[PDB]
Amino acid sequence: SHMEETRELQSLAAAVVPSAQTLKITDFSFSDFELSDLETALCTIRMFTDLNLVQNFQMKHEVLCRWILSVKKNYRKNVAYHNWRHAFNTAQCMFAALKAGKIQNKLTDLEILALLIAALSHDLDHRGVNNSYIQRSEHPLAQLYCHSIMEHHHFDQCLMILNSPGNQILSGLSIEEYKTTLKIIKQAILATDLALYIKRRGEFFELIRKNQFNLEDPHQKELFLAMLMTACDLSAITKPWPIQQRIAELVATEFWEQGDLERTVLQQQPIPMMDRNKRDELPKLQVGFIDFVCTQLYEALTHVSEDCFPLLDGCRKNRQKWQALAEQ
């Protein structure tokens, strides 16, 4: 088992590494069709790289690279998309938002750290399972928490795994930087969940629409951090249609597998989206999702964050294109 995965570790140790500037990841509608889990892990190395977090927080080198590969292996392989690639697109949106969006001139590097680590810990060790499934399939982790149990577990595994061996990038942090780190990451991973995002978002939009937002008023700023977090948690939809076909028809088939669990180990009378029968009607029920979190958030992420506009546009392009599949 591990012998093959560590053979992949030599694939890290013995393969060509295309540059991130060659690999279009700075582009928001990026082609992740060709990247392997290894190459996406390398882009994740870029994500830790350019955010100026390593210099500002003294991260260890290979401890970070194998932070990335260890998170790459910890995901159960039965999962269709909510694995390492999901973290790849999420922190792709995070890295791109904090570099291509040039937000660093605004918000502090501490916050860039909280954004990145919470972005890669938006969905740690995701089992193809959301909050609801464990809340009703009753995995012990569910009883371990209450609200946003997967994400309370993602903060739990943030503070745990980063303190766990092979992952101590928190080691270089000063106690203040460390405090702001795990705390803002706490609230943000709570907001990495689309739900507690829906909870926190209204204060944000009220503080954004009037162009009255201020970064010398820090709680608003951290709330913006959480907004970018949720903006990143669903970023896979930003990807191009030939590829997006794969991505959101794996949203289809993977919520049809989790949905198979919804109609085997759960046996609910099916809800319209995750029913497989809506194979040519599921995308509309993605659009109503996109309207509910995506566009609603990327509008504010448009009027404050700037070059991050395509992160909105790169989603909207999918709309009708999925409506086509949603049009039988």
Binding site: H147, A195, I271, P272, M273, G288, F289
Partner: peptide
């Protein structure tokens, strides 16, 4: 995860929970 009632059925038909 308490939220708006308008959202709940949507939570029951969108990707959230």
């Amino acid at each position: 995860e308490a939220f708006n009632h308008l959202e709940l059925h949507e939570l029951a038909q969108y990707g959230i929970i």
